[PDB]
Amino acid sequence: QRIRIRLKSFDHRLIDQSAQEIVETAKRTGAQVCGPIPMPTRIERFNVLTSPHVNKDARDQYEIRTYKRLIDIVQPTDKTVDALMKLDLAAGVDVQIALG
Amino acid sequence: PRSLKKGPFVDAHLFAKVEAAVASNSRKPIKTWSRRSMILPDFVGLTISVHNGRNHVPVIVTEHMVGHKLGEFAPTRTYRGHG
Amino acid sequence: GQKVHPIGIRLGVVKRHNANWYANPKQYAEYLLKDLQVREFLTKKLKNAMVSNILIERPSGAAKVTISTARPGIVIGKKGEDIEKLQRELTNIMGVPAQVSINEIDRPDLDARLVAEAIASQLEKRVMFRRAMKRAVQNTMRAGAKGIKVEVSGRLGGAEIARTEWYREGRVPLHTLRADIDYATMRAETTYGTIGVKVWIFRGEILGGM
Amino acid sequence: ATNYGTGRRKTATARVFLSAGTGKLVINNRTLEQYFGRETARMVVRQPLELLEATEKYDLYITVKGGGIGGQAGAIRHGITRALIAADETLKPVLRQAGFVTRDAREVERKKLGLRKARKRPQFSKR
Amino acid sequence: ARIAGVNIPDNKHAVISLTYIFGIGRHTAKNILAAVGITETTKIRELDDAQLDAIRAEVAKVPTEGDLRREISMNIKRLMDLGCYRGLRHRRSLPVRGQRTKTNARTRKGPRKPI
Amino acid sequence: AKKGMINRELKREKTVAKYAAKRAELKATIANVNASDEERFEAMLKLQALPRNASPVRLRNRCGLTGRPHGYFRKFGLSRNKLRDTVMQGDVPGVVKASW
Amino acid sequence: RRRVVAAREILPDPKFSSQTIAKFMNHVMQDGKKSIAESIVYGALERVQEKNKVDPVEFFETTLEKVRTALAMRWLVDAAAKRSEKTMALRLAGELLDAAEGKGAAIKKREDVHRMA
RNA sequence: GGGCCCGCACAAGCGGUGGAGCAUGUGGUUUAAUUCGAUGCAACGCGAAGAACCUUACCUGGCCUUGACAUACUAGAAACUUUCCAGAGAUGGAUUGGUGAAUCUAGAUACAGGUGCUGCAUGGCUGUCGUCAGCUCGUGUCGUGAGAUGUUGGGUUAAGUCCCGCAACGAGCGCAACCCUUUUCCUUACUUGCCAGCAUUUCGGAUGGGAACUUUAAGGAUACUGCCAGUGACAAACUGGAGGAAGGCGGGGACGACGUCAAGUCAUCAUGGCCCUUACGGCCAGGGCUACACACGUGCUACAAUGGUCGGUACAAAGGGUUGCUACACAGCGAUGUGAUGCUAAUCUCAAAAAGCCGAUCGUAGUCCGGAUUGGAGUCUGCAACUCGACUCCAUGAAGUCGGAAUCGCUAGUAAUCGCGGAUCAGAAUGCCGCGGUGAAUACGUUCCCGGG
RNA sequence: GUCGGGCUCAUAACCCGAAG
RNA sequence: UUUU
Ligand SMILES: [Mg+2]
Ligand SMILES: [Mg+2]
Ligand SMILES: [Mg+2]
Ligand SMILES: [Mg+2]
Ligand SMILES: [Mg+2]
Ligand SMILES: [Mg+2]
Ligand SMILES: [Mg+2]
Ligand SMILES: [Mg+2]
Ligand SMILES: [Mg+2]
Ligand SMILES: [Mg+2]
Ligand SMILES: [Mg+2]
Ligand SMILES: [Mg+2]
Ligand SMILES: [Mg+2]
Ligand SMILES: [Mg+2]
Ligand SMILES: [Mg+2]
Ligand SMILES: [Mg+2]
Ligand SMILES: [Mg+2]
Ligand SMILES: [Mg+2]
Ligand SMILES: [Mg+2]
Ligand SMILES: [Mg+2]
Ligand SMILES: [Mg+2]
Ligand SMILES: [Mg+2]
Ligand SMILES: [Mg+2]
Ligand SMILES: [Mg+2]
């Protein structure tokens, strides 16, 4: 079969190293990686009034970004699904492993 | 206006009171805070005292007041002039 | 006036966040409000100790909290009754098996939280504010900091009109974003009201970014 | 004999493929007059090939996306000169003097917090 | 050229000139001209005196100047006499559809008054 | 906010959660077509005969910590005053000050 | 401002390669509707081309110094509108042929200055 | 009280406000109440990123009393879950199952509760001068000494920026730089995005395929007066030109020194003091915050021909979607309704961009301009649109023909003009915060007006 | 003269408009 | 030109 791995995170320094630590770990136990494709980033923004009572033009502008990376493993062996599922990954990364 | 596929809206306690009064041909006014119920063709004849914020104003239902809301016949704000 | 907060202005520059987890936009609020409770409970459950930072992570539907205290012996007690009962308390709030890690602070005179807490606990025993300020400034510059500022505000000395008094030793470059700077605020509950302590500690620049 | 150029103007791209042939053009599977109803966008598109006096020695296959009429016309012009100086670098001085080599980097300036539109502030009043 | 007791302009397209009758808009004029079978760009000047009769027949089927004016002026009287909120707002000549009166009601109230 | 307002909100959403299933199935019976018209009229009667506080239209979003009814953000569950404080000190994951 | 500044240069119009023509149609444009402006001026020029055959870029700059530059080009764009002739491309191409033969609307408008000169 | 310098401060230009109608905040007045706060610049589309009930603080009536909520005490009962009657509801009564921790009930003392007062008792947070260029220290020197010098003087700069003279020599915080985004290129990455070259085509990148190009998004390179000429004090800096995508700070943001105004906020929160405690606390239904002789601030729409209407036909960016967004089909003039498909999204969808281009018509009229106000008939959200919602259809068709004295914004992808999206939110934007399309005119200068050094 | 608007941190002079 |  095939494996698609989707990674979502608020930190891209973290998502990069999670992706490039999954890719080489797969490359060791076989071959056929299809690269960490970068999907476009979601950016949502907020305006927050910084004064307790009345000052409209005095606001702090905040931002949060969601990063998404895509990895495909096309023809995996019988020792790669375990070498993947036997892997601990640091906090702040959501990993979705799907077959179709 | 309310959608015609839902029908007219009348409160349930007010409808019970009206139907109870119509069967005994009573003349006592019906006191109510409803003010948002529609005037049904059955109400015609009765005397209803509707709240207006501070008092209950008496209203005599006429054959032309059918289809309005009760609170249309009890104004809430007081005004005479400015000079 | 109206300076920016020294920590939040450099949160993707030279400072990490104190919370490290991901959540779908419909689960974000529950998580946020569940760990704000953990902080607001731990800050008083460990008041006699010298806690300075609390880090919250959620690895794989779990909960990990690192408490960086200056005296772990009290937050642990005998080996097997404080870290083992705290965890049974942090699950009733997080709703998930919690874990508690300890990060002992060496040199607890270079984190602004502990300096501010000490100055406040002195001010709440009727010590002259200038004595306490000068003592702290002198005692942090020996530990190796490249600069420290202290600020105290509000009805000083039991007076009737409030004023602010600050003291500095060294460099404290606040407009340099690659300069790492610790910052803290604390409240002193005196017989006459509230007194506010602010501490800036400068420990050098950061070269390399993130 | 197929050279390639790319030209940005504001948010347009203009992939341009230049080759030898008679003088024929297509923009997005559409002749030049079918594409630009603005009659002065056509004479922005046709500027570099008529500067060198050639106008008839090259086939042009163009695609473009993003931006508006003027944006896409200037993008196509930029791409055409970049596909031209790829064939013969000798032409780069001349095409520089007419100002076709420079990328116009002017963009729309963001709106600002507390202003009407990026430089326009609300109406002031005393007393 | 004279329909519904009104003199309508003669050097004008028919769909434009038929709207000079009180009670006929543009949609109603389109409906009338289509039902009778006349194009909208025809001037009233270019109409035979035998088409104007079918136009008058079709116009008679909808309410026009006097009938409609009286129809409008009777509903307002009924409202004012029944004594609901709208009748009261009509007696006092103030907005009946919920607008603000602290400012901006000068179309119901008219020219301003000094003090 | 006062301490009676927060208990009023708790009261209201408790009652909303109690009457969720019944109100939903009455709403479904009403919007049906293959049922009797007397069916879909008695359903209307029983629907508007519930307590007023069983309707989610009477719920007002308040700050999770203090209880402020204004300046609410759905993504966070806090109002602007506490949002500024908890963001600027680093306790909200992913959020930074925004510059275009 | 308070120190010094320079002026801005204009790309000459793409059809007749003139700079004065570009500067003239920049005074006629409003709200950034340059299609309308170039339609108007190009129509005026291709009108005066078919009547009294003469090169347009030459006739235009010949009639400009009859009225003189910015303030000259303002009187033309003004007095051509307050005319009630037809579409603007035709009551602009009307004041040009008027002012060439010494008319009174924009040509003899500046004469009022020569009296008070 | 004098002198110099700077900034859309004036001057030059372009477009507005003051005039009309409507939206919105304020004052006043009215009211049972029209809840409270913000008053030159720096209050007046401000707290409020959204008052039908709720919100809600206000008014009228009906109700409770250790309480809606906490802690410590005693006695009884698993919490929990059905059916009904009265009542506007709060609230009382009756019924059905269920069998030491949690969990309700009853009683009782300390107490709880207070958006009640003081921002002139305060913490925290903010405005303002103002992104203005200043505020200091250690030595070494002068004045018995408090102190001075440094930091003042000639130029230059966005700048206490730099050079030069100088009893000063250095150093710190401010300025700049480090951070974000845009403009050129390079490397890794090749799907859900791409289609140059092959074939296949039901003409649809659609499908074999391809990894070029666009793009997506992570890391690098590049600009420094480096090169040429002059000006300039052996100077700093300035003027020109060659390359280069770009040239002298390339464009924009974030970042707001020491301090001023007893500036704003006890109604976000915390807090010293004072005050209420069968009420200044708590729970309900209805009303009010939407009133209307009037005055002001901020906006929107127009007064038309560079335009209105009708038919045809092009070109975006950025955002949102599972209690949600909906291809498509049918019904209706339409708002919408029913069915039914895809989508947890570079995949499906909002979604049509609009101004533009080509054609016809209107021919300067209070009009085929303008859309206020009113009558009639509907749709949707919601327990409910009377007071007091938004939208659709038919009819009606005000004022208004460019606005007195005066006054405002703007120095370039800016002003002007044209559409698109979101936060709040069941519903309710002409406000607020963003996104792209088209795309100008002007700057001789510093006497004058305003603020600052 | 009065009432409204303008200039002023405020006020008057002054300016604009209106009613009589 | 009156007052701070
Ligand atoms: Mg724009
Ligand atoms: Mg942009
Ligand atoms: Mg004014
Ligand atoms: Mg008519
Ligand atoms: Mg409180
Ligand atoms: Mg609500
Ligand atoms: Mg400027
Ligand atoms: Mg001026
Ligand atoms: Mg108060
Ligand atoms: Mg504003
Ligand atoms: Mg008791
Ligand atoms: Mg104060
Ligand atoms: Mg304060
Ligand atoms: Mg310096
Ligand atoms: Mg800086
Ligand atoms: Mg004060
Ligand atoms: Mg006050
Ligand atoms: Mg207090
Ligand atoms: Mg109420
Ligand atoms: Mg209000
Ligand atoms: Mg019209
Ligand atoms: Mg008139
Ligand atoms: Mg001055
Ligand atoms: Mg200076």
Residue numbers in the entry:
A (entry chain k): 4 to 103
B (entry chain t): 2 to 84
C (entry chain d): 2 to 211
D (entry chain j): 2 to 128
E (entry chain n): 2 to 116
F (entry chain o): 2 to 101
G (entry chain h): 3 to 70, 97 to 145
Quote what the paper states about this structure.
In this study we present cryoelectron microscopy (cryo-EM) structures of the ribosome from A. baumannii in complex with the clinically relevant antibiotics amikacin and tigecycline, solved to high resolutions of 2.8 and 2.6 Å, respectively, allowing comparison with previous apo structures of the A. baumannii ribosome (Morgan et al., 2020). The overall structure comprises a large 50S subunit, composed of 23S rRNA, 5S rRNA, and 28 ribosomal proteins, and a small 30S subunit composed of 16S rRNA and 20 ribosomal proteins. These constituent parts form the recognizable structural elements of the ribosome, including the central protuberance, L1 stalk, and L12 stalk of the 50S subunit, and the head, body, platform, shoulder, and spur of the 30S subunit. Therefore, for each structure, the 50S subunit, the body of the 30S subunit, and the head of the 30S subunit were treated as three independent rigid bodies and their reconstructions refined to nominal resolutions of 2.7, 2.9, and 3.0 Å for the amikacin-ribosome complex and 2.5, 2.7, and 3.0 Å for the tigecycline-ribosome complex, respectively.
The 30S head of the tigecycline-ribosome structure contained significantly more density outside the expected region compared with the 30S head of the amikacin-ribosome structure, suggesting that the particle subtraction and focused refinement procedures within multibody refinement were less effective. Furthermore, despite similar Fourier shell correlation-derived resolution estimates for the 30S head in the two structures, the masked and sharpened 30S head map of the tigecycline-ribosome structure was visually poorer than the corresponding map from the amikacin-ribosome complex, with protein side-chain and RNA base density less consistently resolvable across the whole map, no matter the sharpening B factor used. The reason for the larger improvement in the 30S head in the amikacin-ribosome reconstruction compared with the 30S head in the tigecycline-ribosome reconstruction is unclear. Furthermore, principal component analysis reveals that the largest variation in the data for the tigecycline-bound ribosome is due to 50S-30S intersubunit rotation, compared with a combination of 30S head rotation and intersubunit rotation for the amikacin-bound ribosome Tigecycline-induced locking of the 30S head is plausible, considering that the primary tigecycline binding site is at the interface of the 30S head and body (Jenner et al., 2013).
